[PDB]
């Protein structure tokens, strides 16, 4: 039984029946604190589109009962004997992944988010063979390598979506030189990831055009996020006028979409960075890719050193997500609103104040 | 009429009926020598898979009668007054493209193969509005910028496929750093482009594995081409054993094929360089691309300065294609054999000795 699996009792909300996707109160347990482990009392957990996709029963490989949530901000309540960088009582945050092989090139050179055996935030076995439970819970236990120090100047609630959506945008931009004034960057899709991509790029001095299928989002894009331009992707005149005008485009969409129009927007040798995870596959336009010498680049989150650097950057530049703070028993309705796009732009669950045992 | 369109008479073989793809003798004409033009008596024309794709009526944009062939080696018989770099009687070669806009960034910085208005080797209008006729003809006229000096020590017949297949492999490797010892390179498909990619990589000192669906090519791959290894892609054990072992893969296939297994062969941050142009669309597996931080990169031919550089490299390192020299009236049978992969590895038409007027 989940409550007997481990010595320390824990509780949260879980999808017990994968065919319905409904979360309900859930008792379970967490491993004892190892020598390099940190126990974290969870304060806030951001909700991302991957949580929704999991809840919609679209990831076969996940094990149920499923406790989702991978944007965790909390307080260290207990550290192992070998832990030194983090002290009890400190504000901390958890990476979007929980472990790596430790031996491959990526791990040894601190690029460990790209470990072939990276352990994702929930739903799969840990090193001890037990299924991981995510951030919609009262406490978690994480190896110290994957725990970050949360800046004092940063809102815990507004900073929580930085741990998956924020780092994905930040790393993709930093890794591919999309963080310098003079760059014209396009951001496709204005959801959680996209709205943070705009904020980070403005902080970098990058000129940003939001590329959207929702014309009512223009005002939010320009007035609230500070984008330099808004491109309605169904406007053939707007699209043709922007041909060859982008150095790079960051694609955040979780649905199937045509890639060829996006490649046409890029100048020769431009980059299309894919950070969204459509559940269905995409079609590759070979001729536009070849004739333009263009690149399709995948990116996923960021390494833990890059994540700490991002958190410090966000604190100094006051970069937070635009959030709605919700109680945990609102989670099923929030999932519906997230499915309809009725959120600007992130749900964050107040775990400390609204979660109680079953 | 094609013979009256221009002042100078010419002849070759053309697809007159695009629905059959059958070539037959064809009379036409070519423009007078402009100030910057070079008239070229064609000696040899390599046959590439794009010629086959054109004769199979798979490129809607091409105009007919269609004279294909874009791997031309010849002799300069006449130069414009302003031409200085090439003298009459010199052995020359033609780039796989015939013109560019001349104004964009790529043109002015000698990256003109990626000009958005590049004029391909045949079947589309030239600057004067007339359809271009390719290398399956007795002579051609080319602006001097797109004419190369052919090394004396290089076989004209064996060197002819360097002008499209050779430059595509060479440029893709040079542009993305796949030309240095220490790199483990995969070459998918052992056709015209693939077999030249192996030869160039061996000359660079790169370790090369040939990835093929035809096990009977193993001996030529290892003994004749000098590949370090041969991977049968339908052997699931062999494929699983090579997971994460490739720094980069060059995909030369002209047919639709699964790309996710190739992404699995790459290490994290690896590159899949696409140089083949399948007529039907390919499927992009986002999750493998996202998981590894991997790249899909398109590349097309090379710029003319790089082409001259490639030709000189081939002369000093004795790089030629493995060819069957054929007479022009064999072209329809050669297309059938090329369609079936029954050639090791390139057809080259002997134009000077076997082409006669209708
Ligand atoms: C930052 C979160 C995203 C979410 N999606 C879908 C794939 C995915 C990831 N975690 C998940 C948890 C539950 C269900 C699906 C996923 C993740 C985690 O990032 C890592 C491990 O470094 C990934 O890479 O899975 C290997 C990335 C990639 C894009
Ligand atoms: C060099 C190898 C060809 C073959 N294919 C198919 C596309 C193609 C090209 N020429 C053609 C002629 C007749 C029919 C189709 C084509 C070309 C030429 O390269 C250039 C202009 O620089 C290209 O890029 O077309 C923009 C490349 C790209 C890959
Ligand atoms: Zn590893
Ligand atoms: Zn140009």
Q: Is residue B162 within 8 Å of B312, Cβ to Cβ?
A: no
Q: What is the CA radius of gyration of chain A?
A: 20
How far apart CA B83 and CA B75 sit, in angstroms, is 15
String of DSSP letters for B193-205: HHHHHHHHHHHHT
Q: Do A291 and B297 touch (CB under 8 A)?
A: no
Q: Which residues pair with B149 in a beta bridge?
A: B92
Which residues of chain A have a CB within 8 Å of the CB of B277? 286-287, 290
B227 near B209, Cβ under 8 Å?
yes
Q: Do A247 and A223 contact (CB within 8 A), yes or no?
A: no
φ and ψ of A23, to 5 deg:
-85, 145
Q: Which atom of ligand 1 is nearest to the CA of A68?
A: 13
DSSP codes of every residue in B24-92: EEEEEEE----TTEEEEEEEEEEE-HHHHHHHTT--TT--SSB----EEEEEEEEE-TT--SS-TT-EE
The residues, any chain, with a CB within 8 Å of residue B216's CB and separated by 6 or more, are: none
3-class DSSP state of A317: helix
Instruction: Output the DSSP codes for B110-129.
Output: T-GGG-TT-EESSSSB-TTS
Residue among A111, A268, A286 minimizing CB distance to B278: A286
Cβ distance B291 to B299 under 8 Å? no
Q: Which residues of A touch B300 (CB under 8 A)?
A: 290-291, 293
Q: What is d(CA B202, CA B186) in angstroms, rounded to the nearest whole number? A: 12
Contact between B66 and B335 under an 8 Å Cβ cutoff? The reply is: no
Chain A to chain B, count of Cβ pairs less than 8 Å apart?
Answer: 113
Residue A249, ligand 1, Cβ within 6 A? no
- Please judge whether A275 and B290 are an interchain contact, meaning their C-beta atoms are less than 8 angstroms apart: yes
- What is the Cα–Cα distance from B121 to B134, expressed in whole angstroms? 6
The position carrying tokens 């499923």 is A66
Which residue is it, tokens 């409904």?
A22
Q: Which atom of ligand 1 approaches the CA of A119 most closely?
A: 21
Q: Measure the CA–CA gap between B189 and B211, rounded to whole angstroms.
A: 6
Q: Which residues contact A121 (CB under 8 A, 6 or more apart)?
A: A69, A70, A94, A96, A97, A98, A132, A134, A135, A164
- Contact present, B121 and B98 (Cβ < 8 Å): yes
> In which residue are the tokens 């991978």 written?
A70
Side-chain half-sphere CA neighbours of B230 within 13 A:
19
Determination technique for this PDB entry? X-ray
Q: In A, residues 224-283, which contact B (CB 8 Å cutoff)?
A: 244, 259, 267-269, 274-278, 281-283
Q: Is the dihedral of CA A44, A46, A52, A57 positive or negative?
A: negative
DSSP B131: B
Give the domain ranges of chain A: 1-164+322-358, 165-321
What is the rounded CA–CA span in Å between residue B11 and residue B28? 6
Q: Which H or E run contains A45?
A: strand A37-47
Cα–Cα distance, A77 to A10 (Å, whole number): 14
Residues flanking ligand 2, CB < 6 Å: A 290-291; B 50, 54, 59, 96-97, 113, 118, 120-123, 164, 168, 277, 300-301
- Give, using CA atoms, the residue closest to atom 6 of ligand 2: B277
> CA-to-CA distance for A313 and A73, rounded, in angstroms?
17
* 3-class DSSP assignment, residue B140: strand
A325 inside 8 A of chain B by CB: no
Token pair of B30, please?
A: 């070519």
Of all protein residues, whose CA lies closest to atom 28 belonging to ligand 1? Answer: A300
| Phi–psi pair at B200, nearest 5 degrees | -65, -40
Q: Is the CB of A300 under 6 A from ligand 1?
A: yes
- Burial label, A342 (beta-carbon count in 10 A; 0-12, 13-18, 19+): exposed
The two three-digit tokens of residue A295, written as one number: 């690149």
Question: Are the CB atoms for A158 and A320 separated by under 8 Å?
Answer: yes
Name the residue facing A283 among B116, B277, B283 (closest C-beta): B283
Interior angle at CA A179, CA A173 and CA A182, nearest 5: 130
* B61 in contact with A, Cβ within 8 Å: no
DSSP 3-state assignment of B212? strand
E strand or H helix at A136? none
Q: Nearest Cα to A190, choosing from A163, A226, A159, A153? A: A226
3-state secondary structure of B247: strand
Question: d(Cα B154, Cα B310) in Å, to the nearest integer?
Answer: 12
With tokens 């290892």, the residue in question is: B222
- Both tokens of residue B340? 């079936």
How many angstroms is it from B104 CA to the middle of ligand 4? 4
Q: Which of B244, B276, B290 would you mutate first to test chain A, the one with the most A CBs within 10 A?
A: B290
Q: What is the distance between the alpha carbons of residues B102 and B182, in angstroms, rounded to a whole number?
A: 39
* Buried-exposed string B237-274: b where 16+ CB fall within 10 A, e elsewhere: eebeebeeebbbbbbbbbeebebebbbbbbbbbbbbbb
Cis peptide bond upstream of A65, omega within 30: yes
Q: How far apart are CA B122 and CA B69, in angstroms?
A: 8
Residue A11 bridge partners (DSSP): A27
Cα within 13 Å of Cα(B275), Cβ side: 32
Q: In terms of DSSP bridges, do strands A147-149 and A8-15 run parallel, antiparallel, or are they unpaired?
A: unpaired
Contacts of B84 (CB under 8 A, 6+ apart): none
Rounded Cα gap, residues A137 and A351, in angstroms: 7
Of the candidates A307, A169, A309, A314, which has an alpha carbon nearest to the alpha carbon of residue A249? A169
Question: What resolution in Å is listed for this PDB structure?
Answer: 1.9
Distance from C-alpha of A102 to C-alpha of A96, rounded to nearest angstrom: 17
**Cα separations in angstroms, B33 against B7, B87, B91, B298:** 10, 14, 18, 35
* Secondary structure letter of residue B130 according to DSSP: P
In terms of residues, how long is chain B? 358
For residue B50, the tally of other CB atoms under 10 A from its CB is 23
Maximal C-alpha separation, chain A: 63
State whether residue B289 sits within 8 Å of chain A by CB: yes
Question: H or E segment at A300?
Answer: none
**CB B268 to CB A293 under 8 A?**
no
């Amino acid at each position: 039984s989940p409550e007997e699996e481990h010595p320390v009792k824990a509780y949260g909300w879980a999808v017990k029946d994968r065919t319905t996707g409904i979360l309900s109160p859930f008792k379970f347990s967490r491993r004892a604190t190892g020598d390099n482990d940190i126990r974290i009392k969870i304060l806030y957990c951001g909700i991302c589109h991957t949580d929704l996709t999991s809840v919609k029963n679209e990831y076969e490989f996940l094990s149920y009962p499923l406790v989702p949530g991978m944007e965790i901000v909390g307080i260290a309540t207990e550290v192992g004997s070998k832990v030194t960088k983090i002290k009890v009582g400190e504000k901390v945050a958890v990476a979007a992944y929980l472990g790596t092989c430790g031996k491959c090139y990526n791990c040894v050179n601190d690029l460990e988010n790209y470990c072939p055996e990276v352990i994702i935030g929930y739903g799969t076995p840990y090193h001890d063979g037990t299924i991981n439970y995510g951030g919609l819970s009262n406490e978690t236990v994480v190896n110290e390598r994957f725990v970050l120090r949360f800046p004092e100047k940063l809102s815990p609630a507004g900073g929580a979506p930085l741990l998956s959506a924020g780092i994905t945008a930040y790393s993709a931009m930093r890794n591919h030189g999309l963080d310098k004034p003079g760059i014209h960057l396009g951001v496709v899709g204005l959801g959680g990831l996209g709205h943070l991509a705009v904020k980070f790029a403005k902080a970098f001095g990058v000129r940003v055009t939001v590329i959207s299928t929702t014309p009512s989002k223009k005002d939010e894009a320009i007035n609230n996020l500070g984008a330099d331009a808004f491109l309605f992707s169904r406007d053939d005149k707007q699209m043709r006028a922007a041909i060859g005008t982008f150095d790079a485009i960051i694609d955040t969409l979780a649905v199937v979409h045509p890639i060829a129009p996006l490649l046409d927007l890029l100048r020769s040798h431009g980059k299309l960075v894919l950070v969204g995870a459509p559940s269905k596959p995409l079609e590759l336009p070979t001729i536009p890719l070849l004739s333009g010498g263009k690149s399709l680049i995948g990116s996923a989150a960021g390494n833990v050193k890059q994540t700490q650097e991002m958190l410090d950057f966000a604190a100094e530049h006051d970069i937070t997500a635009n959030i709605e703070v919700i109680p945990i028993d609102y989670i099923n309705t929030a999932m519906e609103r997230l499915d309809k796009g009725d959120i600007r732009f992130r749900f964050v669950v107040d775990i400390e104040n609204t979660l109680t045992p079953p």
